[PDB]
Amino acid sequence: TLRRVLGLTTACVPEEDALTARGLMEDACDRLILDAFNKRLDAEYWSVRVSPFEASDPLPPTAFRGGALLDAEHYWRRVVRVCPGGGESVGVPVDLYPRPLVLPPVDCAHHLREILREIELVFTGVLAGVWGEGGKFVYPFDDKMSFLFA
Amino acid sequence: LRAVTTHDPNPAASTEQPSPLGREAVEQFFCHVRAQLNIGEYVKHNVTPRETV
Amino acid sequence: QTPLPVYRISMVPTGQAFAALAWDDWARITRDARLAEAVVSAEAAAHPDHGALGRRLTDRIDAGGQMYVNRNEIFNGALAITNIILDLDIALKE
Amino acid sequence: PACKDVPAFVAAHADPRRFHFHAPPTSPREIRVLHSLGGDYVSFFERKAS
Numbered sequence: 393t394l395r396r397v398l399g400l401t402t403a404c405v406p407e408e409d410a411l412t413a414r415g416l417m418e419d420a421c422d423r424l425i426l427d428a429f430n431k432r433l434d435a436e437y438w439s440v441r442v443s444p445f446e447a448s449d450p451l452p453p454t455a456f457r458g459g460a461l462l463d464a465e466h467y468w469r470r471v472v473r474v475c476p477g478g479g480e481s482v483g484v485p486v487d488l489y490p491r492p493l494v495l496p497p498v499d500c501a502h503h504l505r506e507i508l509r510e511i512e513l514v515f516t517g518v519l520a521g522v523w524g525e526g527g528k529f530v531y532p533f534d535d536k537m538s539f540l541f542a
Numbered sequence: 543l544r545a546v547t548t549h550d551p552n553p554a555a556s557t558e559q560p561s562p563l564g565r566e567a568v569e570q571f572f573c574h575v576r577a578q579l580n581i582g583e584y585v586k587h588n589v590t591p592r593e594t595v
Numbered sequence: 596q597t598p599l600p601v602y603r604i605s606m607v608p609t610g611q612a613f614a615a616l617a618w619d620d621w622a623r624i625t626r627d628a629r630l631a632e633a634v635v636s637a638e639a640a641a642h643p644d645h646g647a648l649g650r651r652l653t654d655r656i657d658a659g660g661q662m663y664v665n666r667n668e669i670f671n672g673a674l675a676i677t678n679i680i681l682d683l684d685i686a687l688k689e
Numbered sequence: 690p691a692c693k694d695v696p697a698f699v700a701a702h703a704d705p706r707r708f709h710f711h712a713p714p715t716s717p718r719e720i721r722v723l724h725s726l727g728g729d730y731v732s733f734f735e736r737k738a739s
């Protein structure tokens with residue numbers, strides 16, 4: 393997206409470039425969330441490495457049954473937030489359960505929100521850094537493309 | 543009632559002026575009768591047609 | 596193969612018997628109201644219409660045991676809805 | 690009124706897909722998901738009275 397948006401050096405008033413940039417950034421977000429759907433069942437792909445220092449989800453009482461798998465955990469805890477039943481989002485320590493895993497559908501309405509958060513940080517930096525400032529690029533995930541997962 | 547109050551009894555020198563009651567009532571509230579006239583304009587007021595492609 | 600329908604069965608005297616099925620004998624359930632192509636074609640020849648023709652066509656019409664007596668499909672918000680199913684409750688003066 | 694296949698229409702009421710909320714849709718190129726429409730308690734009478 394940044395390679396395409398700094399390729400817009402075509403002679404234009406700065407105001408025009410801000411909009412034809414924000415449109416492309418929103419389109420890139422769209423193409424990312426569309427491809428996210430085709431990997432909604434790969435829990436290992438939607439996994440975050442929590443450090444032993446960071447705040448961590450509480451360990452389910454059945455992850456203490458991995459046998460010769462609890463030993464692999466030395467530094468990182470790989471957690472995926474799944475959504476059993478409804479409303480509640482619970483964390484699953486991915487590497488403490490035998491494979492292949494069976495899980496409730498992955499709460500992509502939580503991981504994609506954080507990924508998008510950092511994407512909007514980068515996009516707000518570039519939007520307010522090359523052209524005129526004053527624009528916090530926000531993608532309406534909760535309305536435009538929330539239905540795909542929740 | 544302030545629009546019908548007179549300041550002189552002579553009908554050709556009366557100070558009464560046209561009343562705004564019905565025109566104002568029609569302009570604001572009775573202008574939305576078209577919404578309920580087989581148009582679906584009430585939906586158009588709050589439609590939010592979110593169809594993702 | 597998922598996703599799957601989930602039904603609710605009211606039994607006698609009571610008891611909500613929930614039933615999740617992967618396939619079912621719907622041919623048997625609808626067999627009573629299934630009109631053969633010959634019958635419908637013959638009625639169409641007798642009545643070449645759409646209002647008077649539907650008239651003739653309509654006029655020509657244990658939890659496991661209660662499955663084929665009472666079913667109530669249960670809405671699943673996770674899945675996408677493909678049919679507009681409206682429940683018309685008509686009240687009558689006479 | 691202009692049904693070109695009456696027998697099909699009659700033998701379409703017996704297919705469970707025609708009367709199931711989340712039935713399989715009966716080569717899809719594009720698909721438009723209407724996932725949100727109007728809100729609740731938004732009547733013009735209610736919003737004017739309030």
Ligand SMILES: Cc1nc(N(C)C(=O)Cc2ccc(-c3ccccn3)cc2)sc1S(N)(=O)=O
Pocket residue numbers: 737738739
């Ligand atoms: C807020 C606003 N100001 C408008 N007034 C002045 C009124 O209703 C005044 C009124 C109208 C009827 C009654 C009554 C009394 C007994 C039984 C039923 N009814 C009481 C008072 S209307 C309302 S509105 N726009 O929410 O309908």
